[PDB]
Structure formats: structure tokens, C-alpha cells
Amino acid sequence: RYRLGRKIGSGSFGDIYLGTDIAAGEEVAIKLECVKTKHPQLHIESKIYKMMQGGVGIPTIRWCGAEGDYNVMVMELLGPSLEDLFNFCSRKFSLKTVLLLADQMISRIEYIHSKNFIHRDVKPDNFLMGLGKKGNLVYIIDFGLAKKYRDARTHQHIPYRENKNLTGTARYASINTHLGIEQSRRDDLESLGYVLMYFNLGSLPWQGLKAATKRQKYERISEKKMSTPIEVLCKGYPSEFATYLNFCRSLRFDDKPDYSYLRQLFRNLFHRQGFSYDYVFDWNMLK
Numbered sequence: 385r386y387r388l389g390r391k392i393g394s395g396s397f398g399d400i401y402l403g404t405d406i407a408a409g410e411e412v413a414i415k416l417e418c419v420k421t422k423h424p425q426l427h428i429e430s431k432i433y434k435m436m437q438g439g440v441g442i443p444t445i446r447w448c449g450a451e452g453d454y455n456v457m458v459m460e461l462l463g464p465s466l467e468d469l470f471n472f473c474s475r476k477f478s479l480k481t482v483l484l485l486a487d488q489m490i491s492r493i494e495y496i497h498s499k500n501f502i503h504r505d506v507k508p509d510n511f512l513m514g515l516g517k518k519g520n521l522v523y524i525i526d527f528g529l530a531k532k533y534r535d536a537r538t539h540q541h542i543p544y545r546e547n548k549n550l551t552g553t554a555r556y557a558s559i560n561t562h563l564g565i566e567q568s569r570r571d572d573l574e575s576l577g578y579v580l581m582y583f584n585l586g587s588l589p590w591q592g593l594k595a596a597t598k599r600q601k602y603e604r605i606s607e608k609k610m611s612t613p614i615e616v617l618c619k620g621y622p623s624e625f626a627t628y629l630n631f632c633r634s635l636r637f638d639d640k641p642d643y644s645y646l647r648q649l650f651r652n653l654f655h656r657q658g659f660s661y662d663y664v665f666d667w668n669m670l671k
């Protein structure tokens with residue numbers, strides 16, 4: 385039912401192609417999982433996307449099972465990542481673009497939380513703009529590290545746990561993630577806070593820090609992050625950014641975040657600046 389076109393991306397558990405859904409007559413993205421291992425990841429990712437179906441800015445998927453030496457997931461075809469678009473804008477976004485993005489990104493994370501998952505990989509690479517009719521819509525992708533933080537029926541929160549190892553990308557990790565604490569809803573939002581200040585600054589002060597051979601590879605990132613006050617990180621930017629990060633850092637392990645407070649904080653700033661909620665992003669002005 386599918387025709388595979390040109391490769392458009394590579395991921396930790398396989399590659400993303402342009403494809404045709406022959407029955408639907410629509411162009412789609414097709415994720416192929418080649419190396420299964422004993423614990424293949426694509427079928428699990430598809431099951432999390434199924435529980436997120438009906439979410440705005442969550443790609444619609446079709447689990448297709450095996451073909452030859454591949455597992456197949458057909459996805460809504462999306463546009464450039466926010467990391468790609470940041471590079472295209474010379475690694476500066478206007479305050480207006482950062483606030484337009486913040487408004488959607490809080491809502492996307494809230495939606496995932498509402499379906500009893502935490503994302504745990506919040507970074508600009510994993511937010512993609514839509515194409516065509518959905519060009520103004522921020523999507524979130526990559527549920528490869530996503531976890532249930534509560535039972536689907538009980539809403540009994542996962543237990544507190546420490547002594548965990550940090551794996552993958554630390555640039556946007558929460559301070560508690562550096563400290564080996566179990567991730568929960570607060571950590572996704574603290575990560576988003578570092579993403580927003582990254583868009584403001586062009587980089588983060590701990591970005592690209594390398595440890596000595598033999599040392600834990602993240603120790604220089606962790607030390608800089610913990611020794612950089614929020615007020616120093618956010619110096620020269622509207623107070624709302626510091627307010628956002630202080631609020632996230634204050635949340636207890638099992639606390640339900642006040643998403644509406646964080647959105648309204650940025651909305652009030654948007655109004656004080658006299659910005660129009662027009663979805664005219666910096667990249668729309670590129671010539």
C-alpha cells in the first residue's frame with residue numbers, strides 16, 4: 385500500500401523516508417527500523433503515538449508491522465525542526481517568535497502529560513513545524529524515551545527514585561536529571577525553559593563542555609548548569625523567562641504543573657510588547 389521515496393532523516397533506531405500512501409493518495413513519512421535488537425523500539429513508539437491520537441501538533445501514524453528485514457511506521461509528513469529553522473535564522477529568534485513558539489510548546493507538553501506520559505527528550509531537534517496548511521503548527525516528535533508517569537486507570541504517580549544515570553543529550557536536561565532523580569512532568573517543562581533561553585541567547589553557557597577522559601562525560605555540563613543562577617542565565621531578557629524557570633525548578637516530584645500560569649505569563653508579556661498573534665515567524669521573512 386506504500387511506495388518508499390528518498391531518505392529525509394536518520395534516528396537512533398532507524399531512518400525516515402518520503403513515501404506515498406497509494407490507498408489515501410497522500411505523501412507521508414515512513415520510519416524503517418532495520419536493526420531490531422532483542423528490544424525493538426519502533427512498535428513501542430507507535431503504541432505511544434496511538435494513545436496521543438487526536439492531539440493537535442502530534443503526528444498521526446499507521447503501525448504497518450514488518451516488511452522483510454524492517455519494521456514500518458507511516459507518519460504524517462512534517463516540515464523543518466526548530467533547530468534547523470534556528471540555524472536558518474542565523475541562531476537568533478526575535479522575542480515575538482520565541483513567545484509564539486512558547487505558547488504552542490507548553491500546550492504540546494501539557495497534552496502529552498494529559499495522556500499520562502512524559503516525553504523526556506525536550507529539545508529543538510524534536511519540535512518540527514508543519515507543512516502546507518499546517519505551516520503555523522508546532523509538532524512534537526520522537527517518543528523513543530517517553531515513559532508513563534502514572535497508571536492510565538489509577539493516575540497513581542510513579543515512585544520517587546534516585547541514583548539513575550543520565551543518557552543521551554544533556555544540553556537541555558533538568559538539574560534534577562543531572563542529579564540522577566527520576567524524571568517527571570516538571571523536568572519536561574524545565575527543559576522547555578532551557579530551549580526558550582537557547583533561542584534567546586543563541587547557545588547556552590554549558591553548551592559543548594567536555595570532561596577529561598576517564599571522567600563521567602556530563603560532569604562539566606552539570607557543574608556549569610548548577611553554578612549558573614537562573615538570574616545570570618536570563619540577565620537582559622524579560623523577567624518572565626526567569627519566572628518560568630524558577631517555577632519549574634520549584635515543582636515537587638509528583639506535582640501537576642500549572643501550564644495555564646506559564647502560558648498566561650508569556651501572553652501578558654506578548655501583550656505588553658504590543659505583538660500581534662499572527663503566526664508571522666522570523667523564518668517567514670527570509671528572502
Ligand SMILES: Nc1ncnc2c1ncn2[C@@H]1O[C@H](COP(=O)(O)O)[C@@H](O)[C@H]1O
Nearest residue numbers: 393394395396400413459460461462526
Ligand atoms: N514525520 C516526520 N516528517 C518529517 N521529518 C521527520 C519526521 N519524523 C522525523 N523526521 C526527521 O527525521 C530525522 C530523525 O527523526 P527521529 O529519529 O524519528 O526523531 C530528523 O531529521 C527529523 O527532523
